[PDB]
Design a protein around this nucleic acid. Structure first.
Ligand SMILES: [Mg+2]
Ligand SMILES: [Mg+2]
Ligand SMILES: [Mg+2]
Ligand SMILES: [Mg+2]
Ligand SMILES: [Mg+2]
Ligand SMILES: [Mg+2]
Ligand SMILES: [Mg+2]
Lengths: 59, 107, 50, 99, 62, 26, 71, 538
RNA sequence: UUCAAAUGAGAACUUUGAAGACUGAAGUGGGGAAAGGUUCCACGUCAACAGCAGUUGGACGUGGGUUAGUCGAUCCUAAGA
């Protein structure tokens, strides 16, 4: 899965910031789960979503 | 066959001329050979109290004569390479002098 | 030395994290020619030279 | 002594009934690890058949270094072809390089 | 079994050297189970592990 | 091949009313 | 690390190498809504920073561990 | 060996189980059907209340006369696709909500704890006294209440595959109970069913259950069994702890494969007098399956980060099993104290809340609940280190799943029999062959289930009873008779369902089933069944 | 150096006990500086290495471990740069 930049570009600054905070919380929980399960595919898509949101905000 | 006897071993003539660092180990080996000769068993086990009696006066202070009790018994384990073995115990006596070989009734 | 600098400790940390044999799933990859870690370091064989 | 022996009683419990003659109940790990301990060597190979395959591949690859008697992957000592201090000896009447 | 760790832990717990620590040779499995100083203390309490007395250096002749 | 024969046989083999209770909560 | 939860009301975290004790205390209070008594830090031999964070007596590290998920 | 005292202990365990089942049925009806209760109760609350009720009732029986007594099976409430292992603690409710936010609503009832109309709710609970175990499990249906009728009743009967599964489970349960009762008087066995001068066999049991399931278009979930029970050996953890001796009939994916192609358990035994039998039958509906497929199980984990499947359930199992053959001295004092509490429970699966000193409740108080939660936090702290050293293991949560045969056949397994799950924590499921003839291992089958886009989760109905084959001296009525310790017409009364499918009377097996029903109704010259009655509280 | 038991397929060399000795406080004890860099400790474990052996290891595999207002650096200046 993951976020889509063309969907992100239609949002405001507050929505993008809230989505970034939610993504960071999700990444923290996934890092907690990784301590018990070393193969966790969702971390990659959460990281890429964080990068995409930051890119759109900077744009 | 199961049997128990008391013997006297003359360690003096068996350790005559042995290097001082080797006297007590050679006494251990002489007792093992003595038991093998008298009981026909290649498996000979010495009691730790007998080891203490051998080593009591250091590495070069072995007694001239030792009173041993030797019991030929049965090797109860099913992986035994021989059916019988000898067990050698010390007999702490007033003196090891003037003692003949005797048979102990196993009761 | 027990009282070491941070730079030395950082290089030591990198060496410790590098010190490992190959992961076994590397051997199962298609056209894999990496068969052992040719740059393995041990503390008593090749020194790091600071 | 008889009173003490008759007081020291053993009664079979449910653990004796169920687990008395059994063991294990859990697969033993290859590296002796705990439940939540990472296994750097094997965590990428989920199934034990491919684990044994990779183990055999590693054991086969070890053979040349083991014949050369290396301490491991880390033993990479290189001997020179010729030592000059061993092959530059011309000792006149005077000082020498060794005793 | 390998009781080297238990011997070291018993010496440290009792406060003497390893030369003054006695591990019961019959309770080998019980000693082998003890991975911690708390279990070592329990073994010392129940008598599986015993502290030996010092070797005498008498001063009578002096 | 016995496995192939098993797979072929598997492919061959795969290729009013009743009323309980009533208008009440037990 | 889990022993310190019951022994001294202490949580153990892996924190950034750039973070100091002020930042660690502020971040812990912000993320978990607890009062921190004090923070001790070390740099582990693998190059990452480990923080021992002790909470005040009015907060329980056991609850925070249960909320995080490791317990 | 049956005796007066042993039979009395079994009878008391069965009585307590029947009373507990009536208690949970009344609680669910008050929360969702009677609607006299202002706030509806949730699944963890129901499980906790059931456990406390069982402990309070069991406190008064065989006190200071029996070493070990307690709960054998913790109260399990399974909804629809969940086929077993669902007993969440009260402290995991917000955990479930947070783990399943952003998922589908297929498991919404399990995630929120609140039952919904159309739900098949399977309640399982067991009680042991001196190791003599009696277990009950009943499927019930949740209905919308008609606002127009003067009396409370469902608006309409349950229809569809869930109704088919309930009917198949109920009819199979009754037929198997009658068939096992027929072992005491073998001449009353119908001729069309089997040999008149011969007894009851596992082959006969299996063919009857398979015939009923096929008639109602349902599959037998691979956890079902009709097995013999002894002291401390009741299959309370069957897929976890290996057993020295097994006398019973089991259903597996291997058995499904063999039927399609037509201490290891075998159906080559004869039912004997003087024995206690557990009958646990799970029927999964095959209504939505347009092709021939295989019914298997899926284990639920607590890691949301393993996939992107919005139709997945993430949960933590609440029941643990102590492995008494494993020993390891722990480092935490909390963990050591928890292990000391755990070893007192015995050889049955346990919940963390069962170890609390606050539990069971003397008076139901909010402060009692809060002290229970305060205990439960440190209990989880200790349980983390206990599970890390393999001293205790989880009892899995399992969802029934359907995998079509064509995808299995088209799939390739390069390892064949050699593959197995090396990361699996338990030995028994880790090294297993669900399809021995096709050479497909459990890891391969799980991979196929995940790879298929047409693998669905089938609703499950469950019926499980415990019976005793009482001999003439053992029985009161001077004739051999079957004592049903759990289940019957008073506790496990079937809900209002209507299934289009039916047994086809023009088959010999179905004729034998009809004759078994007739001879069970015949109370003069037929068979004698003594049901165990739930007891009054006030 | 010796005896018995345990472990193991296999024990002169591993572990525990039983003995005999030795370092003899300018130690074969207990800590540090330079240097090394995880060798520390646990679990697993023997192909190679430990010039015999090996079930043992500073070896191989997987992990755990170093917490400071008060101890140091940090501040001062020396020869000097
Ligand atoms: Mg001479
Ligand atoms: Mg510091
Ligand atoms: Mg001296
Ligand atoms: Mg030191
Ligand atoms: Mg070491
Ligand atoms: Mg050698
Ligand atoms: Mg190492």
């Amino acid at each position: 899965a993951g976020v889509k930049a063309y969907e992100l570009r239609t949002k405001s600054k507050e929505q993008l910031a809230s989505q970034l905070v939610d993504l960071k919380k999700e990444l923290a929980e996934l890092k907690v789960q990784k301590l018990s399960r070393p193969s966790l595919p969702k971390i990659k898509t959460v990281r890429k979503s964080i990068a995409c949101v930051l890119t759109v905000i900077n744009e | 066959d199961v049997v128990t006897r008391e013997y006297t071993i003359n360690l003096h003539k068996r350790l005559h001329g042995v290097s001082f660092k080797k006297r007590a180990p050679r006494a251990v080996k002489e007792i093992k050979k003595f038991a093998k000769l008298h009981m026909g068993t290649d498996d000979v086990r010495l009691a730790p109290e007998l080891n203490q009696a051998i080593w009591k006066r250091g590495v070069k202070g072995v007694e001239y004569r030792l009173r041993l009790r030797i019991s030929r018994k049965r090797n109860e384990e099913e992986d035994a390479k021989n059916p019988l073995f000898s067990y050698v115990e010390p007999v702490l006596v007033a003196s090891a002098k003037g003692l003949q070989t005797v048979v102990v009734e196993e009761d | 030395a027990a009282q070491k600098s941070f730079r030395i400790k950082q290089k030591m940390a990198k060496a410790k994290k590098q010190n490992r044999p190959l992961p076994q799933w590397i051997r199962l990859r298609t056209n894999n020619t990496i068969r052992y870690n040719a740059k393995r370091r041990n503390w008593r064989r090749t020194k790091m030279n600071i | 002594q008889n009173r003490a022996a008759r007081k020291n009683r053993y009664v079979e419990r449910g653990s004796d009934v169920v687990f008395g003659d059994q063991d294990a109940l859990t697969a033993s790990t290859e590296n002796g690890v705990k439940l939540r301990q990472t296994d750097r060597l094997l965590d990428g190979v989920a199934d034990g058949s491919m684990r044994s395959k990779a183990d055999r591949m590693a054991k086969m690859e070890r053979r040349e270094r083991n014949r050369h008697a290396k301490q491991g992957e880390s033993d990479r000592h290189n001997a020179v072809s010729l030592s000059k201090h061993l092959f530059s000896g011309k000792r006149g009447v005077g000082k020498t390089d060794f005793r | 079994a390998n009781l080297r760790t238990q011997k070291r832990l018993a010496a440290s717990v009792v406060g003497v050297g390893k030369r003054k620590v006695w591990l019961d040779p019959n309770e080998t499995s019980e000693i082998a189970q003890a991975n911690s100083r708390n279990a070592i203390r329990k073994l010392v309490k129940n008598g599986t592990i015993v502290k030996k007395a010092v070797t005498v250096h008498s001063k009578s002749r002096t | 091949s016995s496995l192939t024969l098993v797979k072929e046989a598997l492919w061959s083999v795969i290729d009013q009313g009743t009323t309980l209770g009533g208008p009440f909560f037990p | 690390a889990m022993k310190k939860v019951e022994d001294g009301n202490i949580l153990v975290f892996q924190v950034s190498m750039k973070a100091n004790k002020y930042q660690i205390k502020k971040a812990v209070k912000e993320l978990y809504e607890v009062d921190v008594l004090k923070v001790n830090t070390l740099v582990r031999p693998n190059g990452t920073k480990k923080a021992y964070v002790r909470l005040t007596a009015d907060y329980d590290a056991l609850d925070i561990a249960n909320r995080i998920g490791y317990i | 060996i049956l005796q007066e005292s042993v039979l009395n202990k079994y009878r008391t365990a069965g009585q307590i189980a029947q009373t507990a089942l009536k208690y949970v049925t009344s609680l669910i009806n008050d929360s969702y059907h009677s609607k006299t209760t202002q706030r509806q109760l949730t699944v963890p609350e129901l499980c906790l209340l059931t456990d406390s009720f069982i402990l309070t009732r069991l406190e008064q029986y065989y006190k200071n006369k029996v070493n070990e007594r307690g709960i054998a099976i913790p109260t399990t409430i399974d909804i629809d696709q969940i086929s077993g292992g669902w007993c969440p603690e009260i402290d995991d409710t917000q955990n479930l909500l947070n783990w399943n936010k952003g998922k589908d609503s297929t498991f919404a009832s399990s995630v929120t704890g609140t039952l919904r109309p159309g739900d098949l709710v399977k309640i399982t609970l067991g009680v042991h006294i001196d190791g003599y175990t009696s277990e009950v499990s009943h499927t019930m249906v949740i209905y919308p209440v008609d606002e127009t009728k003067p009396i409370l009743q469902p608006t309409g009967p349950l229809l569809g595959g869930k109704a088919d599964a309930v009917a198949a489970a109920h009819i199979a349960m009754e037929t198997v109970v009658a068939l096992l009762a027929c072992a005491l008087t073998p001449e009353k066995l119908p001729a069309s069913l089997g040999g008149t001068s011969s007894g009851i066999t596992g082959q006969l049991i299996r063919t009857i259950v398979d015939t009923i399931a096929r008639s109602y278009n349902c599959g037998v979930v691979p956890g079902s069994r009709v097995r013999r029970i002894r002291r401390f050996l009741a299959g309370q953890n069957e897929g976890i702890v290996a057993e020295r001796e097994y006398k019973g009939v089991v259903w597996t994916e291997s058995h499904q494969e063999a039927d399609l192609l037509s201490a290891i358990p075998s159906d080559d035994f004869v039912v004997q007098s003087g024995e206690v039998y557990l009958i646990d039958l799970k029927m999964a509906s095959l209504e939505h399956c347009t092709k021939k497929g295989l019914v298997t199980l899926e284990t639920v984990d607590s890691y949301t980060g393993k996939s992107h499947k919005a139709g997945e359930l993430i949960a933590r199992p609440g029941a643990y099993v102590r492995d008494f053959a494993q020993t390891h001295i722990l480092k935490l004092k909390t963990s050591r104290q928890l292990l000391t509490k755990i070893d007192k429970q015995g050889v049955y699966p346990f919940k963390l809340s069962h170890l609390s000193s606050n539990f069971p409740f003397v008076h139901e108080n909010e402060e009692e609940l809060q002290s229970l939660k305060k205990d439960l936090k440190s209990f989880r702290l200790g349980m983390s280190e206990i599970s890390n050293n393999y001293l205790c293991v989880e009892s899995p949560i399992q969802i029934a799943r359907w995998v079509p045969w064509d995808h299995i056949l088209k799939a390739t397994n390069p390892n064949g029999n050699l593959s197995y799950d090396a990361t699996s924590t338990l030995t028994l499921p880790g090294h297993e062959l669900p399809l021995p003839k096709l050479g497909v291992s459990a890891i391969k089958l799980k991979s196929l289930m995940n790879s298929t886009k047409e693998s669905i989760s089938l609703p499950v109905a469950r019926e499980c009873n415990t019976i005793v084959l009482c001999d003439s001296s053992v029985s009161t009525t001077d004739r051999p008779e079957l004592l049903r310790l759990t289940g019957g017409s008073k506790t496990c009364q079937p809900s209002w369902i209507h299934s289009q499918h039916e047994l086809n009377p023009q088959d010999s097996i179905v004729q034998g089933i009809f004759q078994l029903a007739t001879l069970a109704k015949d109370k003069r010259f037929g068979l004698l069944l003594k049901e165990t009655q739930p007891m009054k509280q006030k």
